């Protein structure tokens, strides 16, 4: 197993961890702010997924400073992970294309 592939799998496991920790900490950060909606865990994990993939419908989002900081970590972890996979697919294609030559 090549490095690019390992970094990818590793990025995916880390993403799943950031999603679960993100869901937990967003609820922790948001309860206490009047009007906040990101306050029960099942919808926070869903919020965490749509943030990490950058879709951002939104239907829910953080209103406090710490929930937002948590949002930024989720965003960056998702963008980095999906980017790592893209780059791993590139390394794979470039390697196999040099063999077809």
């Amino acid at each position, epitope marked *: 197993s090549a490095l690019h592939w390992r970094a990818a799998g590793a990025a995916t496991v880390l993403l799943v961890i950031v999603l679960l920790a993100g869901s937990y900490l967003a609820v922790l950060a948001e309860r206490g*702010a009047p*009007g906040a*909606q990101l306050i*029960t865990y099942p919808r926070a994990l869903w919020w965490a997924c749509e943030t990490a993939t950058t879709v951002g419908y939104x239907d829910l989002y953080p209103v406090t400073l710490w929930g937002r900081l948590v949002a930024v970590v989720v965003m960056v972890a998702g963008i980095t992970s999906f980017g790592l996979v893209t780059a791993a697919l590139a390394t794979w294609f470039v390697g196999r294309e040099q063999e077809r030559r």
Partner: antibody, heavy 118, light 106 residues
Framework: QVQLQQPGAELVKPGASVKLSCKAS????????IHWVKQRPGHGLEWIGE????????NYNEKIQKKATLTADKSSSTAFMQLSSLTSEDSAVYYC???????????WGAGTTVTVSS | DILLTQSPAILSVSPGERVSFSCRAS??????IHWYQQRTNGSPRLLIK???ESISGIPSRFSGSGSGTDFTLSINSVESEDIANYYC?????????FGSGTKLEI
């Protein structure tokens, strides 16, 4: 078995303070919150505050005057509510309730009847 | 904070009849409404969660409906054991809040 155990009563003199307890059993998770609800005789349910034991953070009802301070004890699985500088207005049944972080109160304590009298 | 209005405060019905308690939220809360029963001297008891979901251990006679700002708790063929106070509670926005309560009378 009873999931939340609370003392049946507490007598407190005006100006004094008391600390109510809520001992929990059954399944316990990192996502549990313990809530406290106040009910005066003949009246409705009034939310006081909440605490997430696994982390120790508490939030309180801003619409009312703060008489409560919540704390939890991980080892003894007990949540505590310290009421301070009480008056007759503070006499009521205080229930603790458990929420699995999904918004509803699955189970309630039997409640502690508090009386503020000389 | 979300204000939950329960009206009427007292509801009188005849045995076996169908009854409906109403809960109106001051703003839209999807289906994040929960219903509780509290008999004289008893502690509250969860009856319906998320507006219409059944709870194990609760007679099938009980059902909930609504979404948005208007919610209903219904009882098919009311009986004596149903005499109590009924409360709705919302979990859509912080802080959680309760409705003022409806008393069932037979």
């Amino acid at each position: 078995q009873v999931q939340l155990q609370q003392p049946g009563a507490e007598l407190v003199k005006p100006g004094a303070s008391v600390k109510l307890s809520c001992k929990a059993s059954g399944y316990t998770f990192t996502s549990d919150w313990i809530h406290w609800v106040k009910q005066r005789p003949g009246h409705g349910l009034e939310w006081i505050g909440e605490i997430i034991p696994s982390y120790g953070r508490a939030n309180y009802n801003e619409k009312i005057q703060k008489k409560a301070t919540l704390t939890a004890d991980k080892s003894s699985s007990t949540a505590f509510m310290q009421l301070s500088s009480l008056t007759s207005e503070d006499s009521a049944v205080y229930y603790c309730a458990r929420e699995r972080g999904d918004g509803y109160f699955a189970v309630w304590g039997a409640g502690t009847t508090v009386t503020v009298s000389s | 904070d979300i204000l939950l209005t329960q009206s009427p405060a007292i509801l009188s019905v005849s045995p076996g009849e169908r009854v409906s308690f109403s809960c109106r939220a001051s703003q839209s809360i999807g289906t994040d409404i929960h219903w509780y029963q509290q008999r004289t001297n008893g502690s509250p008891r969860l009856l319906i969660k998320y507006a219409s979901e059944s709870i194990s251990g609760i007679p099938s006679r009980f059902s909930g409906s609504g979404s948005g700002t208007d919610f209903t708790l219904s009882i098919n063929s009311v009986e004596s054991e149903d005499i109590a106070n009924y409360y709705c509670q919302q979990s859509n926005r912080w802080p959680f809040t309760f409705g003022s309560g409806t008393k069932l009378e037979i």
